[PDB]
Design a protein around this ligand. Structure first.
Ligand SMILES: *[C@H]1O[C@H](CO)[C@@H](O)[C@H](O)[C@H]1F
Length: 442
């Protein structure tokens, strides 16, 4: 019944710069790849872009006041690299720093803990013209950007995330071409894997030199994969998927100094020739792992990657994603088993549903409450069995720009009416507000 969480526990909400801010070119900001990608015809559902989004660039104080009012203790947000360095390196844009300075000061004043994601997918367009994640030099560009953030904010911000979901950045951005920069080349995609690791390790290195009382980690996407059958090949296709799609792709290098075994079987041809020379620097020690989780997937060997998904009955979200709450427990347990990081946070968990405002003026998203409650329950369980889970972040505070899905997927615990920019706290937000005050369930 009563599920009480440890005394430190960070109850959070999460967003990302391009998904909420709008005004991408205000105050001397450079273009990002998401600006140019979403302005290209055919890339994003309905032609949506981040031009306006939630207009958080102007409504930031109101949004933080919502966090405060809700009593949420932690806010995960990201910094737009091209607001800070419009050409990606070199010149620093003081007006960009001032924007994030105001948010950071406001959160602190109100006793909310800022968790800053350095990179959440809005690469400066000027760097994409030099190859972006494909170019080894990005490890230097990233290091320089990080240094600027640390020097300017590291006095007040003490919790930092280098990369958001590097699997997505590499594979969805450069192999599937579904996300910026919209490329479909498997050799580029694995070079981007590798460069993401090198840039992450370089930023951690600079962090130790500039923020000596801080903590820094990295965030990965994960699915709960289960075999279709009990056949050998099926259980194996599952071991491939976990190793490729989940945290091992990056944590195997960071903790063991090489890519996971089945990843090398499939992908050694696509990785740079002497990639191993980079591994010792890649092992730079991190303070925490962020794990994201939304769903589970039935999979079977199928004679690309030799793997297919099979649709299951099971309730789904508006994303079409299977609701499998024990996934979050499984992934929490697995991460302890495989690499034993000293701290873990759930950095994303949530759901998209076809929310509507009822005539009573409220959003009755019982479907999201049920979703959040089940998963918070599974994360509690993991804590009872010794996973050092220190925090939990709902994706998202606000309905926002859902990348190639545009505004048509609503993940917020607060509804946004895009025609007026009005915020409506959903039932799920009130519910979560109660969970945070009680520090856990029922
Ligand atoms: C994690 O997933 C959510 C929902 O798909 C995205 O909107 C975030 O940007 C990503 F970080």
């Amino acid at each position: 019944n009563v599920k009480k969480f440890p005394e430190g526990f960070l109850w959070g909400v999460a967003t990302a710069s391009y998904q909420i801010e709008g005004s991408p070119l205000a105050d001397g900001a450079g273009m990002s790849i998401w600006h140019t990608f979403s302005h290209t015809p055919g890339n994003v559902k309905n032609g949506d872009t981040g031009d306006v989004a939630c207009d958080h660039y102007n409504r930031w104080k109101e949004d933080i006041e919502i966090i405060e009012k809700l009593g949420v203790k932690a806010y995960r947000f990201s910094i737009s690299w091209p607001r800070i360095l419009p050409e990606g390196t070199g010149r620093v844009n003081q007006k960009g720093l001032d924007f994030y300075n105001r948010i950071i000061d406001t959160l602190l004043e109100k006793g909310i803990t800022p968790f800053v994601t350095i990179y959440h997918w809005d690469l400066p367009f000027a760097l994409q013209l030099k190859g972006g994640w494909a170019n080894r030099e990005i490890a230097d560009w990233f290091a320089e950007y990080s240094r600027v953030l640390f020097e300017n904010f590291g006095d007040r911000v003490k919790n930092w995330i280098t990369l958001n979901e590097p699997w997505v950045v590499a594979i969805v951005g450069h192999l599937y071409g579904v996300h910026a920069p919209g490329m479909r080349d498997i050799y580029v995609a694995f070079r981007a894997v590798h460069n993401l690791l090198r840039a992450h390790a370089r930023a951690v290195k600079v962090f130790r030199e500039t923020v000596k009382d801080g903590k820094i980690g990295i965030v990965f996407n994960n699915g709960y994969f289960e075999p279709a059958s009990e056949k050998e090949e099926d259980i194996r296709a599952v071991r491939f998927m976990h190793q490729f799609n989940n945290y091992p792709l990056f944590l195997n290098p960071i903790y063991r100094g090489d890519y996971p075994e089945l990843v090398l079987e499939f992908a050694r041809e696509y990785l740079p020739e002497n990639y191993k020379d980079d591994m010792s620097e890649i092992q730079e020690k991190i303070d925490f792992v962020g794990l994201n989780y939304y769903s589970g997937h039935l999979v079977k060997f199928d004679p690309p990657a030799k793997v297919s998904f099979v649709e299951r009955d099971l309730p789904k979200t508006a994303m079409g994603w299977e609701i499998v709450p024990e996934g979050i427990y499984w992934i929490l347990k697995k991460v302890k088993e495989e690499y034993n990081p000293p701290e873990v946070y759930i950095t994303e968990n949530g759901a998209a549903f076809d929310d509507v405002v009822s005539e009573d003026g409220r959003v009755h998203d019982q479907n999201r409450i049920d979703y959040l409650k089940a998963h918070i329950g599974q994360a509690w369980k993991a804590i009872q069995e010794g996973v050092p889970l220190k925090g939990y972040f709902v994706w998202s505070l606000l309905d926002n720009f859902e990348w190639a899905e545009g505004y048509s997927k609503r993940f917020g615990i607060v509804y946004v009416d895009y025609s007026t920019q009005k915020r409506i706290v959903k039932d799920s937000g009130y519910w979560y507000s109660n969970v945070v005050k009680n520090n856990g369930l029922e």
